[PDB]
Amino acid sequence: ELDQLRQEAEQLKNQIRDARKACADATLSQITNNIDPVGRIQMRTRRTLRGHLAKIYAMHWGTDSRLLVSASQDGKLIIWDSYTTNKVHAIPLRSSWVMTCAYAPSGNYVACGGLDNICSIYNLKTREGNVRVSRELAGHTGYLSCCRFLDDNQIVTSSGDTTCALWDIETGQQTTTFTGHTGDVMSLSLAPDTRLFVSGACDASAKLWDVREGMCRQTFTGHESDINAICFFPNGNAFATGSDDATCRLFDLRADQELMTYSHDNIICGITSVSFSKSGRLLLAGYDDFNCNVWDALKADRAGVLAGHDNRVSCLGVTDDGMAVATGSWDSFLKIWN
Amino acid sequence: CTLSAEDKAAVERSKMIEKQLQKDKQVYRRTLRLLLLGADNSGKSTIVKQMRITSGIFETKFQVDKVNFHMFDVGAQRDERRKWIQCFNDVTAIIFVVDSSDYNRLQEALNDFKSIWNNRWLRTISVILFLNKQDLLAEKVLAGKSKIEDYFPEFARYTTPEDATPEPGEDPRVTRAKYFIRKEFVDISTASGDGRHICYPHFTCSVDTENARRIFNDCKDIILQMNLREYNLV
């Protein structure tokens, strides 16, 4: 019985691979070779945020490209007015060890978490005029690695229990739970329409799930090490991922296979964060060697380097309008380029 | 300046927040950080409770010689350790508890200590080995029912050091077993250390009340070594 089911799974995997190779008719390098080079890009630090005590670990731009939320292991969330280098809000956190932070698109709510195993959601516009604990979501049996907002009443969280949970803030209950992942889930990304989402885990596997149906529609296994970051193409039909193997792989949902690989010999460290610009041609990926690299997504060549750092590039993100990029590091220093 | 009234008010709020952050930094830096790990068979929980008198992180404050100490325990996080251990970088010490009384699973704890020591992230952080459960180990060795020779074939060849100073009122067999365990752990720690980080093993018991003083002394020696490194003396 167990042997029969294992053999059936092996046969289904082989069928998957055969279908992929059947649709693996051509590579992007062959098609993209006729595209003009992006050329050298000179990105220089435009704004420095200094008021943090320890490692910065998470950051997400809201609907606007001005406000910036940052989370620091000193146990603090800081909302900065990026245009004016002003700390809009400072919030101490009950748990010093923080690793994730999410900004609601409307800006009325912020979320974060870490090793406390409970995701904390606060709000900025309380009638009292002060930040308060809006919600304390509990049930994940492992650290919270990432979290994202579908809307003000829905929140998606990924944890180390090999399970991801979509919660309702009104009732504070696990609205939906996915247990299909095998390894620890590290990062989470939201598709434009929000009807689908993609997650990445330490088993060298990325998985696509439906928000409502909640089944693993497709899986991607092209990495050889633990996956640290995930980001979806702006069109929402593709995504990119990076792992400790010192390489980046970009896959397409529609074809259900890998589309392109970005890497070079000199890089010998893991990946921290990956993101795309408004056009999607610029793929910005952080690194553990105190550097960040922006590559040509289509032609897969080194376009620019951001070396303004003293420690890990823990987090990096792009704005909605794509006017600038933010990068937070272990040295408690935030640098914004453009 | 060009800032409008409502911009200068925001700037004033920003400077107030900066001063508050300075105060929080002042409060934060005066304390020393400890990450405490061990197994269920290890006397972790009793050690934590004595120091006092589904959350994935447990915090414990304790003051020794007018010095504040954070103690952080991870109990609910899964067996996997290489991922969530990166968060605990820049911690002054790592207190690893080993059940010296337990012989069956001593090899697994030894392998765990090897893995933590070989960690690339924890390559400049000091480790304090608390070989807990010393009365139980004493009785187990004295009775003779369980022999460490079977589990560790080199214990037969191992000898009691002449330089060793046995504890008062200690039988030779208990001292030999304790020193053999400490010898194995010290041999593992020394390898790959290269002087970057130092290990500080100590014999500790469940009811022993010297844990605070021993931890303070080890975290003072660690600080002295670090300052030697930084102030251009070594």
């Epitope: 809000h89 | 060009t2 409008s4 409502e6």
Partner: single-chain antibody, 233 residues
Framework: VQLVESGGGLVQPGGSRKLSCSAS????????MHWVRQAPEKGLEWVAY????????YYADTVKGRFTISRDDPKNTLFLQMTSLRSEDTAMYYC??????????????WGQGTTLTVSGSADIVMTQATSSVPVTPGESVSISCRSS???????????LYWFLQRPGQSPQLLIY???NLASGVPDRFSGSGSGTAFTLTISRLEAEDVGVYYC?????????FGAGTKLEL
């Protein structure tokens, strides 16, 4: 949210008085406090402003060297000690909380006020052409107010605020920074304009939408108020 003020009463010419405002329900250390005076059957006049943490203190020309303001943060209290009171100072005095940051909404809460009885060069002249325009429920209305200087700043924010003093009540923020609608105010109310000419439109008038409407600037510290435009049932 609760601001209760006391200390208003009968005074003699030349004496001093002390107004105490207690605050409860909201943080007092993170909110700037404004003292505002309105003469009987007259418009609102700004007295003073004190920022958070006793950082910035600003008065008006007519009350310079006579009024003093202070804030007891632990007691969440505001003190206004005013000297050499005269017949020109009789008025209803309100304490107003304000918060300043990107996306903020200052002048959002007003105290009930205290009744005090005793016996322009550089300021922005906040004109209000309309004086008293009767209107009925179910009819859209609009009121325009001007300024001596183009209030638009390099920031892009036009610092124009619209308040409503319903009969026998304290003023209420309706619109901030010329277009942003305050929390809890109906969407009937809408504000628009350009640097030196602004307007407030109430889509479907109602009994609640009756009172004097005031238009204030926020560039110069004087924080001058508009003259007023009453509505009738």
């Amino acid at each position: 949210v609760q601001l209760v003020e006391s200390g208003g009463g009968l005074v003699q010419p030349g004496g001093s008085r002390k107004l105490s405002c207690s605050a409860s329900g909201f943080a007092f250390s993170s909110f700037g406090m404004h003292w505002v005076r309105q003469a009987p059957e007259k418009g609102l006049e700004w007295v003073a402003y004190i920022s958070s943490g006793s950082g910035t203190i600003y008065y008006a020309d007519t009350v310079k060297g006579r009024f003093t303001i202070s804030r007891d943060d632990p007691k969440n209290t505001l003190f206004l000690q005013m000297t050499s009171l005269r017949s020109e100072d009789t008025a209803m005095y309100y304490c107003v909380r304000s918060i300043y940051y990107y996306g903020s909404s200052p002048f959002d809460f007003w105290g009930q006020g205290t009744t005090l009885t005793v016996s322009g060069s550089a300021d922005i002249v906040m004109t209000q052409a309309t004086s008293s325009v009767p209107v009925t429920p179910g009819e859209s209305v609009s009121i325009s107010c001007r300024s001596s200087k183009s209030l638009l700043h390099s920031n892009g924010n036009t610092y124009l605020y619209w308040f409503l003093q319903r009969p026998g009540q304290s003023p209420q923020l309706l619109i901030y920074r010329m277009s942003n609608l305050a929390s809890g105010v109906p969407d009937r109310f809408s504000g628009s304009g350009s640097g030196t000419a602004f307007t407030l439109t109430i889509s479907r008038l109602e009994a609640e939408d009756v009172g004097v409407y005031y238009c204030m600037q926020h560039l110069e510290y004087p924080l001058t108020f508009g003259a007023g435009t009453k509505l009738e049932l």
